From a paper:
Because Asn98 and Thr102 are the only residues of ClR directly interacting with Cl−-I, we investigated whether the interaction between Asn98 or Thr102 and Cl−-I is essential for the chloride-pumping activity of ClR. We expressed several ClR mutants (N98A, N98D and N98L for Asn98; and T102D, T102N and T102V for Thr102) in Escherichia coli cells. In most mutants, except T102N, the chloride-pumping activities were eliminated or substantially decreased (<50% of the wild-type ClR), indicating that Asn98 and Thr102 play significant roles in chloride pumping. Of the mutants, T102N retained ∼70% of its pumping activity compared with the wild-type protein, whereas T102D completely lost its pumping activity. T102N's absorption spectra showed a blue shift in 1.5 M NaCl (λmax from 562 to 529 nm) suggesting that a chloride ion can bind at PSB but T102D's absorption spectra did not change in 1.5 M NaCl. We crystallized T102N and T102D proteins and collected diffraction data. The T102N crystal structure shows that ND-1 of the mutated Asn is hydrogen-bonded to Cl−-I, as is OG-1 of Thr102 in the wild type. Taken together, these results show that the direct hydrogen bond between Asn98/Thr102 (Asn98 and Thr102) and Cl−-I is crucial for the binding of Cl−-I, as well as for the chloride-pumping activity of ClR.
In contrast, the NTQ rhodopsin functions as a light-driven inward chloride pump (called ClR). Here we report the atomic crystal structure of ClR from the flavobacterium Nonlabens marinus S1-08T. The structure reveals two chloride ion-binding sites, one at the active centre of the pump and the other on a loop in the cytoplasmic side, suggesting the pathway of chloride ion movement in ClR. The ClR structure comprises a short N-terminal helix, seven transmembrane helices (TM A–TM G), a C-terminal helix and three loops connecting the transmembrane helices on both extracellular and cytosolic sides.
Numbering used by the authors: -1 to 265
């Protein structure tokens, strides 16, 4: 897949190359720092919601590992030769992110369903439809990106199909959020709508990143895409995870769980 991606087409200045390495490395640190926070804080979440914080830990590690791997793959792929970072071998590709999404997107959605107070059959069926829609979106996008170098029209049609799945997934998310807001405790009925908007914003960055080959096919475009994934990853995983956990603790306290109450009170 490395020859199928635009990164393989260029030599990089030291500035471009190092900035990309630094973005990815910084992303690793952010996710792992957040992982410690979610871990320590899970003790203050009621059993009914605790799986949500646990899912944030799994997401932080999954994301951090993939970012770590991307950083090593990048440094393995290029060597500074004759004044520029030049491709030495086929080690780098964005495909690994997509594969990872097959696991992370379902986790991110499930945590949302949990704090929404869905349970039993509704939880199971909603999770099923959502993950199918997510998988449809990710798989079609993965295929489309295989054509970013030699067939832009194909990247676009796979993108369109993928976008249909995204739109339908968003409809399910939005509908469940807006219809279940009233069940939310401790003022979280307000907070949860912000979570919806945050997802719409952050998730929308990925398709933009996906289209960079069509509109900025050059080395600075490669930098821009990595920058966009970095903003998106932190918003969709970390900020989103902190909001989910806040909602979970807040609901836990309102429901009578003492450790949550002590926690909010100690701060
Ligand atoms: C933690 C990672 C997340 C939240 C990834 C989200 C990815 C998307 C919403 C991807 C969407 C895409 C489209 C809607 C069309 C182009 C192909 C994709 C898969 C990038
Ligand atoms: C919401 C999460 C925020 C993510 C923070 C990302 C940190 C970097 C932000 C801006 C730095 C831009 C400077 C780019 C200089 C380009 C160097 C080059 O390519 O030659
Ligand atoms: C596609 C497969 C989707 C499996 C859905 C996972 C369900 C999450 C827990 C909900 C439950 O079992 O009640
Ligand atoms: C970049 C693409 C952005 C697309 C959609 C979402 C942006 C809106 C986020 C604002 C918060 C709105 C609110 O809280 O009511
Ligand atoms: C300017 C950049 C703004 C970035 C915002 C970052 C983190 C906020 C997320 C923490 C969760 C807050 C819980 C909601 C609440 O306090 O009501
Ligand atoms: Cl409980
Ligand atoms: Cl990921």
């Amino acid at each position: 897949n490395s020859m199928k991606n635009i990164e393989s087409l260029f030599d990089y200045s030291a500035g471009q190359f190092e900035f990309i390495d630094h973005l990815l490395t910084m992303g690793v640190g952010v996710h792992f720092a957040a992982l410690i926070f979610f871990l320590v804080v899970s003790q203050f979440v009621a059993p009914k919601y605790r799986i949500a914080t646990a899912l944030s830990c799994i997401v932080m590690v999954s994301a951090g590992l993939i970012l770590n791997s991307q950083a090593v793959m990048w440094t393995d792929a290029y060597a500074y030769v004759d004044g520029s970072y030049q491709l030495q071998d086929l080690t780098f590709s964005n495909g690994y992110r997509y594969v990872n999404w097959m696991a992370n997107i379902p986790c991110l959605l499930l945590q949302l369903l949990i704090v929404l107070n869905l349970k039993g059959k509704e939880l199971f069926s909603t999770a099923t439809w959502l993950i199918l829609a997510a998988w449809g979106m990710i798989i079609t996008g993965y295929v489309g990106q295989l054509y970013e170098v030699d067939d832009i029209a194909q990247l676009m049609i796979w993108g369109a199909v993928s976008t249909a799945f995204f739109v339908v997934m968003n409809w399910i998310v939005g509908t469940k959020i807006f219809k279940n807001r009233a069940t939310m405790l401790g003022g979280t009925d307000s907070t949860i709508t912000k979570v919806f908007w945050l997802m719409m914003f952050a998730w929308t960055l990925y398709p933009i990143a996906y289209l960079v080959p069509a509109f900025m096919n050059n080395a600075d475009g490669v930098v821009l895409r990595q920058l966009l994934f970095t903003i998106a990853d932190i918003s969709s995983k970390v900020i989103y995870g902190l909001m989910i956990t806040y909602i979970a603790i807040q609901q836990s306290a309102a429901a009578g769980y003492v450790p949550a109450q002590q926690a909010l009170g100690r701060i």
